A paper describes a structure:
OtsA (α,α-trehalose-phosphate synthase) is responsible for the formation of this metabolic intermediate from an NDP-glucose donor and glucose 6-phosphate as the acceptor.
To establish the structural basis for the donor specificity of S. venezuelae OtsA, the recombinant enzyme was crystallized. Crystals diffracted to 1.95 Å, allowing the protein structure to be solved using molecular replacement. Four copies of the S. venezuelae OtsA protein were present in the asymmetric unit. Consistent with the size observed in solution, the biological unit appeared to be a dimer. A molecule of MES buffer is bound in a cleft between the two domains of S. venezuelae OtsA in what is likely to be the active site, by analogy with the E. coli enzyme. By contrast, the equivalent residues that define the donor base specificity of VldE, which uses GDP-valienol, are similar in S. venezuelae OtsA. Our structure of S. venezuelae OtsA most closely resembles the open conformations despite not having any ligands bound. In addition, there is a lack of electron density associated with a loop comprising amino acids 18–22 (peptide sequence GEDGE) of the S. venezuelae enzyme, implying disorder in this region.
Author numbering:
A (entry chain A), B (entry chain C): 1 to 17, 23 to 451
The structure:
Amino acid sequence: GASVLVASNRGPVSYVRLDARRGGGGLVSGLSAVSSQDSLWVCAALGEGDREAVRRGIGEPGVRMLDIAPDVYADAYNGIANSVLWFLHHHLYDIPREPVFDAAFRHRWEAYRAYNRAFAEALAAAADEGAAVLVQDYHLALVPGQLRELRPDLRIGHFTHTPWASPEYFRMLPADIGDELLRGMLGADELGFHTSAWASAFLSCAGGEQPRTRVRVHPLGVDAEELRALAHRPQVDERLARLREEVGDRKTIVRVDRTELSKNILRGLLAYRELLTVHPEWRDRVVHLASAYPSRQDLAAYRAYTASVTELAAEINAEFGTADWQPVLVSVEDDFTRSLAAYRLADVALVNPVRDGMNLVAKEIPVVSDAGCALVLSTGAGAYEELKEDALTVHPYDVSETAEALHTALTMPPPERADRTKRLASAATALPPQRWFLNQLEGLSD
Amino acid sequence: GASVLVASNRGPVSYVRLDARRGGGGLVSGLSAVSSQDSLWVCAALGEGDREAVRRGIGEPGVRMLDIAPDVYADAYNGIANSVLWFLHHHLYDIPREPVFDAAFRHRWEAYRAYNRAFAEALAAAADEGAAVLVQDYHLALVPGQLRELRPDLRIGHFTHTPWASPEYFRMLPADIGDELLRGMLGADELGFHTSAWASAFLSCAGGEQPRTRVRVHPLGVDAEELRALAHRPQVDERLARLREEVGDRKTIVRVDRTELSKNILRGLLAYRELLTVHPEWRDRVVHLASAYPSRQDLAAYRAYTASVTELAAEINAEFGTADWQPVLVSVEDDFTRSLAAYRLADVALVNPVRDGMNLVAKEIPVVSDAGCALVLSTGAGAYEELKEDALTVHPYDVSETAEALHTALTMPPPERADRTKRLASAATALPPQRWFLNQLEGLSD
């Protein structure tokens, strides 16, 4: 019997041939405020090692891991969730070719239903009378509706971490699919989003007027003390020292995002090319740090995006580079110690996604900046509504405006830059992970 | 000094090495409906022949061809009009990569302004006091505002033959560009679109309180007599005989569209493949006629689409074909004689674009059908609002729904198909080209 339950595809522990491997994060932090004698976290076995753990009865106290059939899991999680819903909500489809709702899609939708149902049955079995249930993200959007039918006594929350598709865009789904998805989520007493634009979009898709479901905005932020302590370890100090050597005495424009289609890395690079073309005074005087670390390697479009990032970076280096200067410093590692050092050094942060739910990098950088950092932020970034007073606004498709914002950011008077950096840090730490989580739990008392 | 003026990129005369030749067709028929002594049609020179005619001072009466500098023409017409605005209004952008509004875009936009201004200045010099000016299509969307400034007395109409972008999609343009485009259009006393959805989208983008612009819906139809006469020439009878032998004793699903990105040929082929998989009784009993004739060869995306259409048709032939049956008959030529024959033969017509202004094919087939034709029509087709009661409706992304409509179409009992065809033919001809255009001229009374 649990009185507080969480459901997410990914739980706190992963097992490998068995050894246990812990990932932290927002949910670990949030549940650490809840009595561990009263909570249960339901999650999925992510691969063979996790399924073996479940097979042997090996598992963490307060965690229930579900063995969902590998082909049903692939079709639900990689198929519908991470391809079809991810693309829908981020507006990423190449309209002449995708989406395609065919017989195979329908088969994969049936698995998505069955994947969600395994979670709903687990929660239904474990939850005390009137328990609070917090369902996390688009993977489990049918759970609230399924679980409402099994257990009308439960208090059910669901939080979407992505954007929500605009109503016109959402109507690409066949009507029966769209409608099943909306009913799935409308089973909740409370639906949460990071921003009111995402919340409004969901509300418009539902037709307005959904009186049993409270729609709310809980924008996730950062724990200042925790991030600062990590950023000031000697390993970061060391790596920062090496990074200053690599950059030289030059200014920095920093990003660290993986090559995900919504991140808008290419147009960012194009804006950098135009900056160096139009404002030649920056040649030998600035370096753009960017990542070409792959987001995904199992879709053709994602592999082509990563390759285009690599190639465009190399074109810019060949055009403007000298023996002493590399204009784009490309990282292909995923090393958080290096990112923290990049955050500490940054003169300019380039956070220009087409659309996103909440990129925390916009919040993380100002919190750890050693001497101030100007933020170039797109209107589609989830952090936009909270940070727009002290960031330089850019419209994500507008490369010329993005190039000009880089110039304004690079020339921002140092005391203005500090005042902005301090106000950005304040807004960024308003709702750390633990209070973000507790507000959702509190919302289920409403 | 003329009292009725028409403006379009393409005029009614083409010069070939010199001989004036008049290609005609439905829309040129319409725009010519007010050729008189007191009228003028301003258009651009399109080949070296046209350019020679202008340089020499050779022209047909009532026609003024403009020699626009070749680089301004390329950037304005191929670039901004046929690439930027075409993609915008049909929603064809691949969001992770395009659109990109950079320095080169800005330079092409300046050419688009100058190209529109060449037309505006010609019209200004040639129009009598309070003359009616009918400007045609998205190429010339700035002319009304430009001309309005030069000549406040003129009565100006503008007709858009494409869709209009939804307000959210239209806001991808930089705000100064979007606002200039809208002010360009709003110079007019009347703005015309083929459908209410398109007019409504423009009205929503324009917002505001524009008291001197009325927005009207004039859907272009077909002249039955001109079309039937062309469809029953001996050359069509002869090509139709051959086509029956190519097909054999089998049903036909017909389309003739070039490989343009909005046409949705790939999803149509996937629906055909699904039809033959789910209703396999149709093997050896139907042939799908489709075209792989190129729409364009100067954009990478258009070359890729043509290659995909070719490849997919070949996969379907390899998958289901036998010595005596080839399921997809691919045409790689552009012969209107063959197309009229296929119109007359068609059991099913497949008109499933993602979005279009008015494709007349949906109207032409029922007009000339020898024995009845079942029309499968997408909700995004321009003809949808007029033809939906007797067409089988499909949603353009729903390949299963499109495959099921193909089955319903092929199994339709002949007398139901006949009644539907007659009603379609009636709807198709309610507003033929000459009246369509005369109503616009009458619209400029007041």
